[PDB]
From a paper:
HA consists of alternating N-acetylglucosamine (GlcNAc) and glucuronic acid (GlcA) units and is synthesized and translocated across the plasma membrane by HA synthase (HAS), a membrane-embedded processive glycosyltransferase (GT). HAS integrates several functions: (1) binding its substrates (uridine diphosphate (UDP)-activated GlcA and GlcNAc); (2) catalyzing glycosyl transfer; and (3) translocating the nascent polymer across the plasma membrane. HAS transfers the UDP-activated glycosyl unit (the donor sugar) to the nonreducing end of the nascent HA polymer (the acceptor sugar). This reaction generates UDP and elongated HA as reaction products.
CvHAS was primed with a GlcNAc monosaccharide and then incubated with UDP-GlcA for elongation with GlcA. The obtained cryo-EM map resolves a GlcNAc at the acceptor position that is elongated by a single sugar unit extending into the catalytic pocket. No UDP density is observed in the active site; thus, this pose likely represents a state after glycosyl transfer and UDP release. Although clearly attached to the GlcNAc moiety, the extending GlcA sugar is flexible because of sparse coordination inside the catalytic pocket. We note that the carboxylate group of GlcA, either when extending the priming GlcNAc unit or as part of the donor sugar, likely occupies the same pocket of the catalytic site. Our new viral HAS structures demonstrate that, upon extending a GlcNAc primer with GlcA, the newly added sugar protrudes into the catalytic pocket, without spontaneous translocation into the transmembrane channel. In this position, the terminal GlcA would overlap with the sugar moiety of the next donor substrate. Therefore, we propose that binding of a new substrate molecule translocates the GlcA-extended nascent chain into the channel to avoid steric clashes.
Numbering used by the authors:
A (entry chain A): 38 to 291, 297 to 452, 469 to 552
B (entry chain B): 1 to 122
C (entry chain C): 1 to 8, 18 to 121
The structure:
Amino acid sequence: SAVWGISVYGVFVLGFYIAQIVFSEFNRMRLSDWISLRPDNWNATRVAVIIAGYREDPFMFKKCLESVRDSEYGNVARLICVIDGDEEEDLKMAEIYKQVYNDNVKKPGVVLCESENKNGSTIDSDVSKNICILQPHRGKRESLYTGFQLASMDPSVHAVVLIDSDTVLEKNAILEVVYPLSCDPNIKAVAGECKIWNTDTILSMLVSWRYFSAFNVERGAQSLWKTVQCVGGPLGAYTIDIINEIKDPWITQTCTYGDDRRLTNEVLMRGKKIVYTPFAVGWSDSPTNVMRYIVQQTRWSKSWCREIWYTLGSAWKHGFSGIYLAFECMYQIMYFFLVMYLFSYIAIKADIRAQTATVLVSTLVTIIKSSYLALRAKNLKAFYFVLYTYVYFFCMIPARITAMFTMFDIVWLWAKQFLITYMWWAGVLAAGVYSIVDNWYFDWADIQYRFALVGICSYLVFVSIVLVIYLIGKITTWNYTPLQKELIEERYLH
Amino acid sequence: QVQLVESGGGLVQAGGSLKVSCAASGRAFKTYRMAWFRQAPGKEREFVSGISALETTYYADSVKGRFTISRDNTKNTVSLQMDSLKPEDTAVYYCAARRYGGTDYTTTGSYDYWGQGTQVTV
Amino acid sequence: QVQLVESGLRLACAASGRIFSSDTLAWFRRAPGKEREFVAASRWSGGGTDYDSVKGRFTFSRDNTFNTMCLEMNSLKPEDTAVYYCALRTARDSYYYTRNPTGYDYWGQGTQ
Ligand SMILES: CC(C)CCC[C@@H](C)[C@H]1CC[C@H]2[C@@H]3CC=C4C[C@@H](OC(=O)CCC(=O)O)CC[C@]4(C)[C@H]3CC[C@]12C
Ligand SMILES: CC(=O)N[C@@H]1[C@@H](O[C@@H]2O[C@H](C(=O)O)[C@@H](O)[C@H](O)[C@H]2O)[C@H](O)[C@@H](CO)O[C@H]1O
Ligand SMILES: [Mn+2]
Ligand SMILES: [Mn+2]
């Protein structure tokens, strides 16, 4: 039973990752073939860059605005920038815009989507000028909808580029997002790559490589079938036709945390296709605190638990080649359930052989994944992704359980946020202590016991030397991405 | 500490089938290495069989394919079956137990818990 | 905040300050005492435009690495004599590329 379980875990997890790697390679080959047909200085899709933020660092907001202004795409309509402000503390952030683009900030008294005439002409009168909208604070969906209306005002706009407030775009990060929209008539949305730049703290570095894996191996595989489930928040283009069609149903959803997931699922439900372009890069920061990361992950997992049913229900709309979407959703559910069941069974049946074999198998699977990541990114630091196998067991599984319990129920705030996490940590510690107490003997004459002790000690040495390598990298500042070094230098200069 | 009580030892003059087993009373029998030791008039004490903590079987080179061992954690007993007994095996069978040890499981000084034993009369 | 200084036949202008890739730089000519005339324009990434009279004879080139640019008078004639100005137009107010000297807000000193 245990041997079969740990054998399945290693062919059911590494096998699908190999399949995703192959599909991602095929998708990248297809995109390279498309790009090789792109003529020089190509620009045929008028875009309207949309930036929506609530309370961002003035430095990071200025960097994002300057990065948008640095884009080399030769066909941009405007820079509709919606801010959930209209307050004294938030006005300062809008001032950043006034020192980067212009003093064309507008202060409408009402939010467009909560108005009787939800049309762009109520706020803006001139469509040929960059505009900053200081609408009342209601959320990100409301500001994105106001941006959608202001973009749809222009009859010459064919696409809309959505960017987070603190996303430092690359130079060709607009040309490579909106190009695939013209490659196929069926493609109505494109998701660009988002790379973490603040890779200094351990959690931030592990999350950076999780982002890289999820965008290059998990989103590319879906992009091969043109069924990307979630367009990246920091960067993504939408055709103006599909956004005009789905801006009404996406809003008034009956609600606050999905944001881009519901938009992408709407594009899927309409029957259209979404691709992913790894050649378009947008840098964004990652959470550093473990508690804040757990809160963010439980919000994301609540949104995922809400949207997986709508994603599954739209798999028939795509007919054939839509089996991959339903299979991916089913695999996502069964992976978490199988991990929980296998680890609970292993903890309950305190066998040192099974526990050590499970640890070694998981470490080897993560090592193979990180090896492919290092090959793909041409970066050795990708092997730090091995340590990410800790985060999934301490910051993700409790997040999944908390999201499931909150969805099932549909100092109290602390208990609602951190009580399954603390209970999970106490349970893991208790399982370890019970395994140590029960299996408290030393028999250096059994091959099986020799294997168990040698394996656990070698794994401990492996993670210790990986952590030592990370520590010497941090003190050497080798871990910092070049963008992080540039941003730190410029912030110190200020 | 563990206390061992040995049972078995009927006359099997030419072949047969009987069970000799040592019931153990202690705290944690799942983590004890059990072993079987003979004592013959011409010798002092010898290893004949032993089952490790994780159900690993060990037999002596002289008698390997004519033996078996079993451990019952639900009863804290271990039994050594008899297969094609020979006249040279007229020794008194003892039961040995240990928790912490090294790479020597065939010596009498490795184990620190012993029972009383029983004859064979074959 | 950019200061443009042009020297100089092959005129060349260096613009001190940060130039975003979306800025559009143009060369204008001022006839002796009537009004400025358009000569050429191009963004900091490509897509150059030229006047009707100036077509194929003057080539627009930008360094893109040292914030300098040059214009080549491969077929200069006494007919097209004027004072040459180099101007920047930021896409700070509008992305609409225009042929109007009033739209450009940063100007260099006239040459020749
Ligand atoms: C408290 C002390 C006295 C005993 C308990 C030690 C544990 C806190 C440590 C030692 C071994 C570690 C485990 C080594 C291997 C893994 C596999 C690792 O990856 C997985 O298999 C989960 C799914 C995946 O990431 O692929 C999850 C973390 C985990 C359980 C580690 C969790 C933390 C553990 C249990
Ligand atoms: C990178 C990405 O696409 N993450 C998905 C989540 O989108 C987040 O949405 C917020 C937002 O308020 O718009 C952004 O600030 C984050 O950067 C985005 O990560 C999405 O909510 C989640 C739902 O399943 O799925 C993620 O993949
Ligand atoms: Mn931020
Ligand atoms: Mn962000």
